[PDB]
């Protein structure tokens, strides 16, 4: 894909793992049942302050080589085309054509 | 088919009568692969008919069977746009198949409350030539009677 998309993905990963702990603590405060609704209101208002790119839900899986955003497989980290290409040359250990 | 390779497949006897023909009837009556329902239905109907007749299930079923089975049918044969209706004989196994199929299809089209009652009433009627199945047999016989000029 375009280089811009790859840059955006890298930046999103950086922001997410930079703000992970603070997001965790604020979300833990909000999710609690034994608390003060004023504290919950303050925590809600504070959670919006962070940049939107710090959410892990803002990241899209992509091929490690080409950047294709469709057809991903979590086990290998590649889309279908590159999986087949590499697998046909014996570069993925233990993988072979199936028949049963 | 073009090859003529098939043979014939084995059929199991019925549960509590030791008859193959009743098993074939149950198979004809079965839907969706639910054989237990069909066998219970046919058993109930046969029991009711035996009670209302007194002979047995076996020969009562047989007597209804001679009254519906055919003896000659027609086959089409295209010549020049129209078709010859050539009459040909029927093998006994096909006689039984056609009789059972006509019986079941006639019984399925009725207005009683249960399928067992439908089947019992229809087959009791057919035992003495009053149902729609015997009417279909008569129509087939008449149509085969008309076109015997082409029976070589």
């Amino acid at each position: 894909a375009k280089q811009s998309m790859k840059a955006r993905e890298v930046k999103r990963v950086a922001l997410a793992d930079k703000y992970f702990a603070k997001r965790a603590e604020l979300k833990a405060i909000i999710s609690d049942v034994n608390a003060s609704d004023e504290d919950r209101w303050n925590a809600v208002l504070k959670l919006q302050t962070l940049p939107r790119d710090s959410s892990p839900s803002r990241q899209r899986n992509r091929c490690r080589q080409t950047g294709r955003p469709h057809g991903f497989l979590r086990k290998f980290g590649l889309s279908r085309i590159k999986v087949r290409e590499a697998a046909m040359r014996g570069e993925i250990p233990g993988l072979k054509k199936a028949s049963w | 088919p073009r090859r003529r390779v098939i043979g014939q497949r084995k059929i199991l006897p019925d549960p509590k009568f030791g008859s193959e023909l009743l098993a074939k009837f149950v198979n004809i009556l079965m839907v969706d692969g639910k054989k237990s329902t069909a066998e219970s239905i046919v058993y109930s109907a046969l029991e009711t008919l035996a009670q209302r007749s007194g002979k047995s299930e076996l020969e009562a079923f047989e007597v209804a069977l001679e009254n519906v089975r055919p003896t000659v049918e027609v086959k089409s044969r295209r010549v020049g746009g129209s078709t010859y209706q050539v009459p040909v004989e029927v093998r006994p196994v096909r006689r039984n198949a056609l009789a059972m199929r006509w019986i079941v299809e006639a019984a399925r089209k009725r207005g009683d409350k249960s399928m067992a009652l439908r089947l019992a009433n229809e087959l009791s009627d057919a035992a003495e030539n009053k149902g729609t199945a015997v009417k279909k047999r008569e129509d087939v016989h008449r149509m085969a009677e008309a076109n015997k000029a082409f029976a070589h």
Partner: protein
């Protein structure tokens, strides 16, 4: 001594023990009628011992696993026939002539890519 037998059918496997006795039949620590509510299964189980007529002259201890109802009944047939062979060899031709000895190898076919089922195809239109 107990005579052993093993039967397999569809996805069901059964093991059978036969000894001299007064006609008791036990399946999975239950009676014959308790295990199989279906009558066809009962005649299926009892066919072999009835062909040779040692129903009340033997005692049968059977267990089953896997599959459904008819598969378990067929496995029971196979096991009892093999145990009867192991108990007496003069009966082999008699049970072979009835088809009891052949092992039924019919399995379920796999689903194939592009088809709704093993053989059913999707609906096709010319235009």
């Amino acid at each position: 001594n107990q005579y052993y037998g093993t039967g397999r059918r569809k996805s069901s496997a059964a093991r059978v023990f036969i000894k001299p006795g007064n006609g008791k039949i036990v399946i999975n620590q239950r009676s014959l009628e308790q295990y199989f509510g279906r009558e066809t299964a009962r005649m299926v189980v009892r066919q072999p011992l009835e062909l040779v007529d040692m129903v009340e002259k033997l005692d049968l201890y059977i267990t089953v696993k896997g599959g459904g109802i008819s598969g378990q009944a067929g496995a029971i047939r196979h096991g009892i026939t093999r145990a009867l062979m192991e108990y007496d060899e003069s009966l082999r031709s008699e049970l072979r002539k009835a088809g009891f000895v052949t092992r039924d190898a019919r399995q379920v076919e796999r689903k194939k890519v592009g088809l709704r089922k093993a053989r059913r195809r999707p609906q096709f239109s010319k235009r």
